[PDB]
Each structure stands twice: as structure tokens, then as C-alpha cells.
Design a protein around this ligand. Structure first.
Ligand SMILES: CC(=O)N[C@@H](CCC(=O)O)C(=O)O
Lengths: 405, 436, 436, 405
């Protein structure tokens, strides 16, 4: 499912065209972002205009009875503004100003009419998408009994992400990305699994940053590995959504390969079976997975696979210059370069390696790029890397030719 | 669309239907089109009937504001949870828990209709809040029941402007943001007051109003003429009196162009454009004014204009000029509305009085002011004769109002109420005598 | 679209129009709607008029097969190349060179129309060959002129199926592949024969046929009844005689369902569905068969089934059984079409004969076989009386056929042709006498 | 204009979906190919079905009076079949079965009702495209007087290409190309200026082939040197339309390459020097063309150059496994695969060859495809072909490594 985009209210006032044209682009290429917005700046100006002092404790707006009336009006206006904007560019939008979030009071005497989201109702957002309209949500919850409660836009966004498990979660701000405070290096990427601990330890990472990165981790720990969070400025949005660099920060968990040395260590032997069935010489070749796995049990080998076994490499360690014996990766895996991931790991753990690919394998070109040498014979190509000993090359080639037997 | 045309044509029979449809499509006026109050019962039991019908209006380019309740569904749920549904004074005592059931039902019923319509290619836009603001009607008597203080146009407009049907729930909310339950029929009226739409359709089960003393389905009511004497009737029940009263009160506020329909769901497409349909259509109309001398007409020139549309004066061999000379010296009774859109003149000499002139513009034909005038005539003149051109546009209508007819020289003699075989001969003979 | 609906509704007046329109939208529809022969003169001088009009049909979901000539354009070119245009027997002597000019013109005229239609949003598909196969008509008399041996449907069908109007040139071709010039009016007939369309419209400049002695646009012609006496007329010019004759010859080949319209381009949308329009519509109409005894009816059971549709026999208190008893011993004339879709019975006793039964199915009403039957009646019975129920479905129609009417006891006495003041009294008195 | 695609009739019978869906894709992305189809088999199948020997001289069908009737019927059927197919997939198609080609008799007694296209009328094809419909032409001409004449599909296609000068000209066949009928070697390139005469002289080149290649030469003699024809299989159509490689036979005019063995034979020594100055290691590299040509004079070498010296290849013939020493081709040449031209000639004159390409040359992938083996070192890749002696490979690699001095 595609994206949840949290829009700061500031943007609807000051960049309606930039924003609208950009969502319109997504709409045009057939993508349907769930859009959820606040209304910060606008509201304080109105409360002043009516002689109400805007009022906060703990970074939360104390939303009393009168203030709610101003807040509600602003939400609804800001929300049509965006919908209208989008319609003008030919994009079907559907304002959804209630009926998505249900909440309790966060603290009835501290904050008055501020909410705490207890659940998300999908049906409106789905209906909208199904009917070919972008859904444009206000971050406004409501008790069962029907009192509307003001609720934090950033937390609403998260609650949606949790339910809809979208691929991208974009937080549109003014600032833009995150800047490394000690070198000014705009941080364009963060792989949490690797980088998180040492980033939180940094002198420069301010408290506000720590809390943001932490809350992003907490979100991403349960969504798919496919998902990611982007902190960008509005203009460089179209860019950051598909290019991994862009000009904003993109955070994600970062992907896993698991090194195993025995069938024993695989959590499901049946998962392995399915994984191996996509092979060119097992899918109906003359070697049943059954009997192949027999040979493995009694074999010096190292395997590398992601959790879903979308890519499985197997290095047989006998014969100096070990052989990459199987490398069975689904198309899904090729497109997300998990294949590059797996070779990178291989290249570090096996400084010399040989393998064979069919002369007209779909991505023979790729293999060539990863090799240091190639030899063609009988519609198969021997590839190897890291063995620039003139002599062991001869050995290698000779054995390969020997086995068109 | 083939689709639309087929369904248009299914719901036409008389030309007077065709002429009314045409008039709604060549509304050059960006006056607002219609508010349609839909009982909740209909969304459960006739979603297709209703949706296809709204879809037709959408297709022909008309954009009804649709406002719906949720009555039946809710009581069934409260029972299902072991809560007694609870009313005082015909109002639902909507406590905290009950509101939660009501709100859920509103939102469901509402998507149900929007989704339905989308499936048929109609852009719908659910508007479940932000239109009606209310106070509490009485906070300890009714708890969370509202009283509508105002209506916010922007959502409904924006929707229409962006090409989507707006589908409103009848659910108000205090400034502070507590949703209050509010009567669907009253909400419909408050919209109508603010948007001054041309049609206000109230979908019910009953259908129209039936004349309890003759079974004559009452298809039309011009209040300015008919209201008083209709309320005076033996057969008219209290429930009816209250409905008609509340419709008068509404239409007194709106333009003369506007009108209210009470119909059943199935005959909806029909009653929205055809003046007859199979339900009752109320509107203000104008009152007919009985006068007995040119003196009493406020504008003599207005009279002259009125009479010039005649088939035998617009260039026939009796100038209105000379006719109005004869009138001044004549025993006559006249009937016309204020705008002289319809004028009848009965010359009272000769037993069996002659309806000497009867000249109504097309406007008048479509709003059956013609029927109004004949009804008055039929009461004030139990026997009457009159002559219409052989190929008058609505010669058929005259035939229906007559008890007998005679054709000669491209004119038809019509009469009613004189079934004496003999005075008929006299009548016919004099009429023939005067083609020379 | 509002656009279309408006233009549909502009061209409706009677319900009989509405009911015909409905039939065409739920007809055989698509393939079998109509063949429209367009004179080439029109593609040069009225492309918009024509295009917009076809476009309207396309929009309400109808798919006319359009077949055009190229007359004028081609002579202008042949002159422009210094070739004399050349005819014997109303056929163009199409030699080798002249064919090249004819072919070029066909193909141009043909795109011109398709393009024009596309520009208005109508999918069109030029079909410039592969429909008609022909022999030489006479190789030395006419050179490259053809004689249509057969019509290949597949292209025309495919086009309609894929939602495009087919635009045919009238250009045949031998099996071996030499193109032969073929008369557009004859081509149109050959299509009609294969596709049995409901309408065959011949677009001309002239317009319809105008009664040269009263200026009365002749809007309808039932050939089986009217043909002989029309041809006998002083005013019917030779050119008219030849056209009507050639139309009879065509319609004698096609179904009874079929009909030919001779109209001008502008009143096309109108004449295609409305039975009046402002052009002449010809059709064969029906052989009504005059019988004077039950004996002569080919099936007595067919008669009984025919009469059972009556309002006072379908469950009224006079069984068809006993009615037919009374007929056997009765001076009567009956008129019925072959299918007994309409059956009229005139009881001949009592001066002013009575049309005693007139039992016509709805099918019959819509195809005005009822008008047929009355036309015959009117000729064979110069004075006639009849009684119809006050609320018969088409009481209005009866009124139009009468010269006088009297209402009593929910029945209307109608008569025609007796404008003797006195025998009218007699007539009315007897009628009143028999509600008791 | 985008492309003319000649579709063999065989394809409409055996791959209507493959073909239709593929054109449908082009239609969807807003491209409008002119599609011209034949009707070969279907017609031959009928003539057999009626016991008539299909009858050809010179690769042309002797179309008598009856045989034309069969042809015409088959054209019209095959043509709707394709239009209908496309419509079903949402693509507006417009059958154009006449009125595009006007012809004389090619030879009235040799071929009977076969035509010779005297002109092509654009207006129908343009109107169709303008009106948003794919035009689907039959290759069927007609005399001024209106006799329809049969015209080879391949020749009609050339006549369109001539008039419309489309960017791509695709000839869809079954083979996937032209396969050398005596060795099964898929011919991937044909430079007509060099190869044409000796290819037509071949035993295996069937009469149908001769007529297609001839009509392609005639076409390409009219058009720019930039233009070319691709004869591909249906599945690699989407591919060949945007990728410059794709994979079937690609024909084009090329230049006649001139084999010289001494500076003496070059008509201008100054023209040679200019040609070599575009090199990456002479344009300001540490080996002046001046001194390089000194070494050549005293060198066993073969050179190959077109007349304009847009491409110059130099094979140094010492050391078994000769070296392609210089290969200096302007960008113009690269884009028009003069590199393919030159390799074809090389492969015929030198059954074993070695050469070196930069690790990140723009078309390193191409070189890999032309090789039988590769070795990477010091940002250069050694390539060779035709030497599968395990031992001389060692020699080869060792010397190459030796020379990163
Ligand atoms: C044109 C001709 O003489 N011969 C070919 C043309 C059809 C095709 O190219 O498939 C034939 O078989 O009739």
C-alpha cells in the first residue's frame, strides 16, 4: 500500500501549489497517498483575533471549549483548501474530517478537549481510494459519544502508518532533512539496524532529534522492512519518494542476511524447499530438492539468506576456489538488489569464488560485472573473482571444461 | 448517455411532462437545484431505486443536495444491545451511549449510499459533519439532542462546484464540537431556507396525499388559492394539516419558483420533473381574483396583453381593442391570477353562460393554473359552454373537462352540466348558425 | 449529457413519439436501426448539419449505417480534366479514366465525413471497399459500372460492435478485384435487404412531398391503402410518381416492419423517431380484410383470441363465446389485418351504423394500424357512431377522430359525419336510453 | 513519425495476443505505430485446401484472377482479426484496406495481378493517427482505373518507410532474425555496403529472403546513414523499439571497410592522422600520433577503415592471438554501430583475436557479448575470442598482467 503523508498546516497556507501539484503527480502516475494534515499557525492568529491567549503545557495545546471552536473551523477550512486545490488540478479528493480516529481524553483537566487515539477506522479511507479519490484526513479524533478532540498530527500519522503499513511515511516539514550538527553534512540516509546506537551517542544529536529518531525506530520495528520514513521539505518531495538520496533524510531499518552452515539452523526446512524450487535445474530439472538437501547435510557449506528466503546463496567450500553452488533469487529479489546485498557479503567472506551461469541467463551482464574473469563453453559461462594466480585459473577452467561430460 | 435517455423516456407520457422537463434543463438560472430528504428506511430497503434515481439527476447535470436520516436501523441495534429506545415529545432522548449507536449508524448508512452511487459512476462526497451548528434543545430532557442555530454552506458548495453529489447526515454540532442528534425533516428545511433550491423532495413510505372523500390522489396544491378551503375539509386529518402547514411556512420564505414534493421513493424520477407524477406537489402559486368590470382590473393594459395571446385575436378577426369595448357594457364575471398569466371571462347572458375568453400562457398550463380556474368555474357555473380552436395545443384537456363536444368549421363547441337532450340541440344549432 | 437530452426533448410532442423513441432504444437496436443514404451534394454543402445530426444519433446510442454517393463533385472534376460527363439510362458510363476520378472523389468525400464526425467525438470508420461484390452491369454499354451480386456484412458489423459509425462508399468490386461504380440509391436498397433496418432514410435537398393542391406536407403514406388514389392525383408530378413507385417496389421486398423516410438533412433527428416530422414517411401498411360472416375468418379460434383483449370480455360480463353467437345472426362488416392485431366490427342495422367492437393490441396502437383501420372505416362508412369507456387509455384519440361527443354514465358516445342537428338528438337519446 | 511495423501474416494467426498487447502498450504510452500486415500462410493454406500449387517466381506471387480473390478475402479477414483484437484491449484501430498505395502492373504476363507501387497517399494514415486510432494497413495497391494489385508486404513496408521517414522500422518475423541457413548462426548485423553482394550470392539465402533484403537495401539507399531496419521476433519488440541493441538481425547501409596493410595504401596520410587524434591516449596522451605511425611503418599489420575514416581498426599480427591494437571511431560511429560492422569483418578475417577495453567503457557489456573470455586487472579488461586452448589463455592473461607497468 503506498504512502501516509503528514502535512504540517504551515504548508497548506504557504505552499498550496507546490504541495497540490506534487500530490497531483502521484495521483496521475496511479499512486494514492493517504494525506493527513494539521493546522498550527492559522489557529493562533485567529485565537488572537478573538482575544483568546493561545495556551500550551508540555508542548500540547490546552484546547478549552472556545478554542476548540476555532481549531475545528480552521481544520475544516485548511482541509477544503487542499481538496479544492487538488480538484483544480484534476485530482479527485475526498475530505474526511471525522470518523477515522476514536479517542479518550488525554487528560481532561490538564488539556481539556485534547484526545488520545484509541483506534483507527479504515473503511472511509479505503472507500475513498477504491472510489479513485485521494483521502485528505484532518487529525481530529472523537469520543464514542461524539465530542471532537484535538489530537497531535504526528501521532495520528503514526497510528495510520501502523494500520495501513504503507511503503513510505513522509513527514513534510519546513526545515528539510536532518543535518549532522558537527560537519553540516545533510544526512540523506539512516539504516537503523546498523547506525542507530552510535548516532544516539553523538555530541551534536539534540534532544529533539533523539526523540524523533527514536519514535521513527519504534514505528519501523513493526512495519515491513520495505517501509521507510522520509523527513523532507515540500519541494524536494517528488525526488525523495523514489530517489534514495533526494535532499532530505530517509530513515529505514535496513535489511538482514543470515549466515547458516547447516540445514539445522534454517527455521523451516519447508521454507527452504520452496525457496530452492525456483532453480533452473530443479523446477523440473533432473535433481529433486529432496535429494539435493540430502547432499547438503553432509557437506562443508555456508548459506546466506534473507528472512523470507527471497534470495538464497550457497557456497560449497571444498575445492580451493569455493563454488557458489546455488543462488536462487526471485524476481522480487533482483529488482530490490538483494542480489547485490548477497554478493557483497559473499565477497567479504570469500575472497576467492567461482560460479557458473547459463550463457543466456536473463542477467548474465550482472554476473560479468561482479566477476574478474569469464570463460564460455557449451552454453555456460564460468565466472570467478579474486584468483589472479595465473595457475589456479588453468586448474579452474580445465575442470569446468572437463564437466561438459 | 444511452443509459440516461432510456430512463428519461420511461418516465414521460404527456407532453406537459416533456415541457416541464425542458424547463428544468433550460433553467438558465444558477438557482440551486434540489434538497432531497431521504428517510433512513430507504437506504436499507431501496438503495438501488434511490441511487439509480440520483444517478439520473447527476447524469443530466443536476446536483441535488441529499440529506438522510437513520431511524429504523438504530432502534434495531439498541434492542440488539438491550437498551430501550426512548422518546419524550416525539424526540429521541439521546444519552451518551445511545449517541454512539446513532453516530455509527449514520456513518454506515452514509457510506452505503456514497459507495452505491460511486459504483454507478456518480461522484459522491460524504459530509458527515461541519454543515449544521446547534445548541442543546434541552440538556436534561433530551441530553444530546440539538437545535439547529445555523447552516454552513461552504462544504456543500465546494462539493457541487467540484462535481460531486453531497450526501449529508442530519447531525449537528455545538461550537465546542459535541455532536448533537437533530431531526432529519427539520434539517432538510434549514437547508432549503439557506439554499433556496427549486425543488424540496421529501421521500416517504405513504406516497402522496389522497382526497379521503373521493380517493382522488391530490397531485398538486397551489396554496395561495387552495390552502384555506383544503384545511377546512371533513376528510383532512391532523397529520396532514401539520404537514401542509409546515410546507406553507417553508414556501412563504422561499421564491415562487420553489416547490415541495411528497412522494414515495419509486415515483421519484417522475415527480421531480413532471408536474403530475404519483405524489403530491405543493407550491405557493397566486390567488385567483373574481372581477365584474374593467374598473376592478388594476391595469387595463395588463388585461389587453393577456388577451392578445388568443388564437382568434393574435391576428384573428376580432381585435382585443373592440372586444374590451364590448366588455365595458356587459354582464360578465372574470377570473385571473395576479400576473394575468391566466384569464377567464364568463358572459352571463343566455342560460348556459359562455366562457367567452380563456387565455393562459404556457407558463400557466404547466403550473395547472388552468385547472385552478376551471375548478372555480365549475363551482360558480354549474352549466357552461365554450369554444376552442380545432387544433388548440391542449384540445385534449378541454375534452376531459367537458360532458359533450361538437366540431364545425375548425372550432369545437364544448359544454358541461347540461344533459337535457333538448337544450343541447339549441346550443349546437346556435353555434352552427354562427359560422355565417 | 444535458446537451443531448435537451435536443432529444425539443423533438418530442405526442406520447406516441416517446413510445417510438423508447422502441428504437430498446429495438433490435444497433445494427438494424437504419440505413441512411446520403447524396454527395450534402457532404459538400452541409457537412456540419449532417455531421452534427449523425453525432446526435451516435450520442443517444443509435448506429446508423451511412452510405454515400459523390455526384456533383465528380462532374466538376471531369470537366476540370476535359472529360465530358456521360450517361445512358440514368447510369454513368464509367470508362477507365472516369473511374479514376470517381474513385478519388469517393475516397475524399468519405474521409471528409469521417474526419468531420471524429471532430465532434463520434467514432467513425471509413469502409471504402469490401462490402459490395458485383458483376458488370453491361460491359460495353456502361463500361466499369457494376451490378451488386452480394453484400458482406462483417465489416459493417465489426464497426458497430467496436462502437464506430460505419461510413460506406457505394462502390462495388468483382471477385478478381476491379472496382465497379454502382448507383448509391440501389446500393442503399441492397444493404437494406441484407440488414433489414427499421428505417431507410433517403436524404435529399427538396425535403418531403408537399400536396401540390393544398400545401399540406404529406407526412405519412400507407401504400397498401393509399397508393392507387395518390398516383391518380392531378398534382402528383412525374418526378414524384417515379420516386413513390420506386419506394413501393423496394418496400414490397422488405418486411412490413420497414419504412422509408424522404427528408431534408435538418429535420432528420426528428423524422427518424417521430412519425410526423417534416418529411414524408412511406411504408406498406396493412392489408385489412373485409369479412361479413364468421365463416370467412380463417381461424375462428384466432378471432376468439383477438376479441379476448377487450375491457368488457377479458373478464367482463359478456363472454366472447356468447358474443360470437350474436354475430352469426347479424348484418355486419368486419375489418382485420392478417395477424388479427386489430379487429373492427361494424353493426349495420340502425341508420348511423355502430362500430361495435374495435379490439387492437398495444402493438397495433403504437404502429398506428388503428389509424389504418379508421381510414378504411371512414371511406366505407361516411357516418358512424361508437362508444368508448370514459377512461379508455386512448380516449383522446377517439375524440380526434370524431366530429362530436356525448358523455354519460362513464361512457362517451362518439360519431362522425352526421352534422344534421336532428339525427344527433336521435343518436344521443338512444345512447342515453341504453344505460337502463 | 514514430515507427512502421511490418507484421508477417503468420503472426496474426499464431500470436495475436502477444502482438496486440504489445501494440496496445505503445498506444497507451502515446505512441502511434503505422502497422502494415501481410497474409502469407493463410492464403497458401487455402490454395492447398483447393488443390492449387502456390505459385511464385522471383519471390513474388504469380497472382492470377482467382488467386487475387483468395488473397483479397484473406487480407480483409486477417486485418479485422487484428483490429478487433486491439479494440478488445481498448486500443482504437482503423482498418485501412485500400487507398494508400497506387500501383502499375509489375509485369502483366510474368506476375499477372501483381503491382508496383507508384505512390503512397499519406492522408488516411495521418487522419487516423490525428483521430487517435492505430492505422492497420493491408499491403494491397490499386491502379488508377481501380484494379487491386497484390504487392509484397515487405515491399509495401519499405514504400511507407520511404515516405514517412519514421524513426524505427521493425520487421516482425518468426526466426528472430535472419539465421545463416548453412551454420545456424543468427546474423545479428548486416552492413549492406560491405556484405550485401556476397550474402545474396549464398546457396542458403532463399528467394523470399533475397527479395526482403533487396527491398531493404533499396529503402536504406534513400534514407540517411543514421537509419536502419530491425528484423526481430515478436517478443523482443517492446525491447528493440527503445533499446539500441535489442536482439534479432539489424540491417543498415554502413560503409565499405577497406583493408590496408601499409601506410602506403592510405590515400591521405593526413586523413589517417586526424582520424587517430580522437584516441583517449593520443588526444593529449603520452604517445603522439606522429610516433605511433612511425611504429606502424615497421610492423606486420592489417587495418580496416571506411572511406571517411570515421572508424579505423588496426590489428597487429605478431603474437599468436593477434591484437586489435587501435580502434578509433567517432561518436557518430558508436551510435550507428560501426563497431558491430568492424567486428563482423574482424571475426571473419581473424578467427582468434584479443583486445583490451577500459573497465568502465560505456559499452563494456557489448564487448563481453562478443568475447569468449575476459580478465579484469588495473581497470582494464582483456577480451579474446576463438582460443579455447587452456594453455595459450594463460600466456594471454600473463602478458596482459605483465603490462600494467
Ligand atoms: C504481394 C505478393 O505478390 N505476394 C504476397 C503478399 C502477402 C504477404 O506479403 O504476406 C502474397 O502472399 O500474396
Amino acid at each position: 500500500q503506498f504512502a501516509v503523508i503528514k502535512v504540517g498546516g504551515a504548508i497548506i497556507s504557504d505552499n498550496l501549489h507546490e504541495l497540490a501539484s506534487c500530490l497531483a503527480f502521484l495521483y496521475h502516475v496511479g499512486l494514492y497517498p493517504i494525506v493527513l494534515h494539521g493546522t498550527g499557525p492559522q489557529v493562533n492568529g485567529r485565537l488572537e483575533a478573538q482575544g483568546i491567549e493561545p495556551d500550551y503545557i508540555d508542548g500540547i495545546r490546552i484546547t478549552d471549549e472556545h478554542t476548540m471552536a476555532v481549531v475545528r473551523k480552521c481544520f475544516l477550512e485548511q482541509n477544503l483548501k487542499l481538496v479544492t486545490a487538488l480538484e483544480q488540478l484534476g485530482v479527485r479528493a475526498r475530505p474526511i474530517t471525522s470518523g477515522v480516529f476514536t479517542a479518550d481524553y488525554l487528560d481532561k483537566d490538564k488539556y481539556k478537549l485534547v484526545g488520545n487515539i484509541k483506534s483507527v477506522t479504515k473503511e472511509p479511507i479505503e472507500a475513498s481510494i477504491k472510489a479513485g479519490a485521494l483521502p485528505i484526513l484532518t487529525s481530529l479524533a472523537e469520543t464514542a459519544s461524539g465530542q471532537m478532540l484535538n489530537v497531535n498530527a504526528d501521532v495520528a500519522a503514526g497510528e495510520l502508518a501502523r494500520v495501513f503499513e504503507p511503503l513510505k511515511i513522509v513527514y513534510l516539514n519546513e526545515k528539510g532533512g536532518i543535518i549532522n550538527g558537527s560537519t553540516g553534512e545533510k544526512i540523506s540516509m539512516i539504516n537503523l539496524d546498523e547506525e542507530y546506537d552510535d548516532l544516539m551517542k553523538q555530541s551534536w544529536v539534540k534532544y529533539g532529534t533523539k526523540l524523533k529518531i527514536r519514535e521513527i525506530k519504534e514505528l519501523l520495528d513493526y512495519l515491513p522492512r520495505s517501509s521507510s520514513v522520509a523527513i523532507i521539505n515540500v519541494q524536494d518531495l517528488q525526488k525523495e519518494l523514489f530517489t534514495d538520496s533526494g535532499a532530505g533524510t530517509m530513515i529505514r531499518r535496513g535489511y538482514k542476511l543470515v549466515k547458516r552452515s547447516s540445514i539445522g539452523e534454517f527455521p523451516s526446512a519447508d521454507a527452504l524447499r520452496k525457496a530452492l524450487q525456483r532453480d533452473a535445474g530443479i523446477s523440473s530439472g533432473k535433481e529433486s530438492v529432496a535429494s539435493y538437501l540430502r547432499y547438503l547435510e553432509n557437506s562443508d557449506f555456508v548459506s546466506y539468506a534473507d528472512e523470507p528466503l527471497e534470495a538464497v546463496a550457497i557456497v560449497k567450500k571444498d575445492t580451493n576456489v569455493p563454488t557458489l553452488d546455488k543462488f536462487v533469487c526471485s524476481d522480487a529479489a533482483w529488482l530490490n538488489n538483494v542480489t547485490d546485498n548477497v554478493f557483497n557479503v559473499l565477497r567479504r567472506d570469500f575472497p576467492a569464488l567461482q560460479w557458473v551461469v547459463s550463457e543466456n541467463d536473463a542477467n548474465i551482464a550482472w554476473h560479468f560485472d561482479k566477476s574478474q574473469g569469464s570463460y564460455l563453453k557449451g552454453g555456460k559461462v564460468l565466472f570467478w573473482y579474486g584468483i589472479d594466480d595465473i595457475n589456479t585459473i588453468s586448474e579452474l577452467v580445465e575442470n569446468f571444461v572437463k564437466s561438459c561430460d
